[PDB]
Amino acid sequence: AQYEDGKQYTTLEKPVAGAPQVLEFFSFFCPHCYQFEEVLHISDNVKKKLPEGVKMTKYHVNFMGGDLGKDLTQAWAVAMALGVEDKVTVPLFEGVQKTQTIRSASDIRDVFINAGIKGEEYDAAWNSFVVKSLVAQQEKAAADVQLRGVPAMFVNGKYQLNPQGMDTSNMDVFVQQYADTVKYLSEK
Known part of the structure; x- marks a missing residue:
């Protein structure tokens, strides 16, 4: 076949009912995630090839960068609650990995x-139980798999996508292969 389990994807031994349709996990401490966001724009090209009526979900994870990594998961919860993901993703990545000017909450x-989010607006969000459950959501989804x-x-x-089984000669070709694979899986 052209798409084979164990090649462009793997199948979960233990399938997760009720799961979001397209679910992405990243960390601002994760170097491939940086590449995925800044250089490849994986999330964006996938979306463009999905049938519409499809929900695309992205969560942060705790297991990189210790205490700051957990701070970052709460911040990404704030970002989703305020709907400001597109305004903070790039400076959070570059603050963590490029300029390394992010050292504390x-x-x-x-x-x-x-990025123009107001102080009271951020601090209230940060401390809200709406954000606490979005943190819960991120962790539960990672726990599930x-x-x-x-x-x-x-x-x-x-x-589960397996990017190791695609070619990395050309960066653009990688993205389309990745995105086409998601769409195949989506229709499966």
């Missing part, structure tokens, strides 16, 4: 302020 906060690595994509809680 207050530094994370500064990114949101600079025993996630130990990122970047990671899951389709219909049953298939």
Whole structure:
């Protein structure tokens, strides 16, 4: 076949009912995630090839960067609640991995302020129980698939992307292969 289990994807031994349709996990400490966001724009090209009426979900994970990594998961919860994902993703990545000017929760906060989110608005969100449950949601979803690595994509809680089984000669070709694979899995 052209798409084989164990090649462009793997199948979960233990399928996860009720799972989001297209589910992406990342960490701002994760170097391939940086590449995925900044250089390849994986999330974006996938979306463009999905049937519409499809929900696309992206969660942060705790298991990289210790205490700051957990701060980052709460911040990504705030970002989703306020709907400001598209305004903070790039400066959070570059603050963590490029300029390394993110060292504390207050530094994370500064990114949101600079991006035009208001102080009271951020701090209230940060402390809200709506954000607490979105943090819960992120963790539960990672727990469900025993996630130990990122970047990671899951389709219909049953298939997991395997980018190691695609070619990396050309970056654009990689993306289309990745995105086409998700769509195949989506229709499966």
